[PDB]
């Protein structure tokens, strides 16, 4: 059965007198560093010479190169892009990781690939959040959290489990739940969400926009209905709480509910489930891993080209027009990662 | 052309047309409760007209002046018909049309009853659509935070010549002008709204469910599979942040390079031609009257078939997994008690 840790199952006692080195200050690193500090945990940032180094300094952290951070740390969180783990592990982390220290990754991919490996005398774990940084930080400040998966890969000390779960409690994940899941399963599951589900959801939204525009509908209205009004996202986020079919039962007019249930369970041909299986096969059999290693070349040049090209697509041209014309509800984000 | 769109914000609307006027909110459901609460908090005189059911009692519990529909209409300058569309015809014929004052304005929140001829222009009166693009709880939460949701409007009949400023005064009072209120014909609004409900919403959920089913079949932990396809809130957060800054932009901003490379490997390539073809079939059913005939049949027995479909959907593996996940993982929520009581 499942092992799910909440606040009752974790404590900050294991972090008493210990220093955490957050390696990276990106989407995850900034959120971990901010929440650890506000939870009363001694934290240091290790970072290469880029904008994230300057940002960590601007937000009041003790910031050094990665080797120096690791050498002054009891716990090391490797929160940099996965393709970078191998070289940083070999050169900066492994030579400086104290005897009895804990190294944590936030995704299983570098463990599956053998780029991050158990070290004699040291602990190794995965603590993999199921949400990006801004919500982890916003939830933390509101007394809430996002879920995470964890795995104890190597435990020399016999104290790795409570130290990993203490980090999880300090960053807020035990407010939701931290479930035991093998790092190989986390890797394949996580990549599947990114490679099948996220693109399929955006492709469906784009398909709806294209068909409406083809059939003579107002492009601003078409863009608002398929996602830009926030209704489809609100349905999906409220659905996380109460269930997706339940949101329609509770919030839908009878007209809406009758229409929804006419086509619910009937919209997709078998080619969709077949492509999901093909994506999982690419993930499980190393084809994506090889593709990722290639794309990391000249600092992700091909990704830069794909990012720029996507902004020129009709959906994103229409998004810029709608967003300039309709005010979307936002909250001020200035100072979000400064000390609370 | 994009330049042709007529979009009103707060600077283009005022509460002045509502000075000394009473709005009758007919119905106190998903839309009715939000309209009533926001109108009252905006300083607009509001009454609720409702049949004898749980919504009558809720309106009283929430401090409103509540009567049957005919009495509400008889004492109002503006009437908002916020009940299910299939009920518009009988309520219009029996309770509204005979009681609507000279020079009063009737608004619907969906064009379907206008397309079908169940709600019609009345000599000496005004008729309009103000169609919110969001359900009630967000309209209310946004309103209380000084925000709003978009809406479409159409002036169908304007005896007084004052219908536009009165419709937009309602829109400002309920908060839609804080986002934007765009002119769109009631017929277009009808088909567009139905398309969102019959193609896009069920396809998004079917896609989430297909992901869940494939993961469970391939031996993944069902709780984890459920969390990743939506239960974590990540896919919802992606789509809601995407509404702000763009869907491809959320991935560029918030995704690890591993995530962005994976996403861009399959973006624009996941769906076969048959999905597009199905979207066109659903539009054909909506535009040609097939869906209107289906809906009339479904309603004719107080939605008995919908009750069966709602109960059957809760038994699907995705929804069984949802209850297991929800029990075991705490989801961030905000207290909702008293949300619709006076500010
Ligand atoms: N983004 C998310 O929502 C998310 C969620 C869960 C897990 N993760 C995991 O968290 C880890 C960090 O991902 P992220 O999304 O925060 O990444 P990111 O793209 O925000 O990472 C930027 C950070 O990485 C550093 N960096 C980049 N290239 C480097 C290199 N070659 N050597 C050293 N430092 C380098 C930068 O200086 C900066 O500190 C990854 O293992 C990722 O899979 C990400
Ligand atoms: N739900 C939404 O998010 C939403 C959004 C925009 C537009 N609309 C439109 O708003 C209107 C109201 O829809 P809703 O979703 O609030 O409905 P709902 O299902 O919440 O409506 C319940 C209300 O309708 C009343 N009602 C039901 N059957 C009735 C009958 N036969 N006679 C009289 N009153 C009756 C009930 O007493 C109650 O006040 C519709 O035109 C709908 O298309 C709904
Ligand atoms: C809850 C969401 C799917 C509803 C679509 C709504 O905007 C409304 O048009 C309705 O008829 O319910
Ligand atoms: C924003 C969302 C689609 C990203 C998936 C994230 O949880 C993370 O796994 C990543 O690698 O970026
Ligand atoms: Mg992830
Ligand atoms: Mg509707
Ligand atoms: Mg709608
Ligand atoms: Mg990931
Ligand atoms: Na337009």
Residue numbers in the entry:
A (entry chain A): 2 to 341
B (entry chain B): -1 to 341
Pull text from the paper.
A trait of BP bacteria is a conserved gene cluster coding for the biosynthesis of polyketides (malleicyprols) with a reactive cyclopropanol unit that is critical for virulence. We show that BurG, an unusual NAD+-dependent member of the ketol-acid reductoisomerase family, constructs the strained cyclopropanol ring. A sequence similarity search using BLAST predicted that BurG belongs to the family of ketol-acid reductoisomerases (KARIs; EC 1.1.1.86), well-characterized enzymes that play key roles in the biosynthesis of branched-chain amino acids.
Our structural analysis revealed that the carboxylate of a glutamic acid side chain (E232) is in close proximity (3 Å) to the β carbons of the substrate surrogates and thus probably facilitates the deprotonation event necessary for enol formation. To probe the function of this putative catalytic residue we generated a point-mutated variant (E232Q) of BurG and assayed its activity with the native substrate gonydiol. As predicted, the mutation hampers the transformation of gonydiol into the cyclopropanol derivative 6. The observed chirality of the bound substrate confirmed our stereochemical analysis that gonydiol had the 2R,3R configuration. Intermediate 14 is firmly held in place by ionic interaction of its sulfonium moiety with E232 and cation–π interaction with Y133. In contrast, the neutral carba analogues 12 and 13 show a higher degree of freedom in their tail regions due to the lack of ionic placement as visible in their crystallographic B factor.
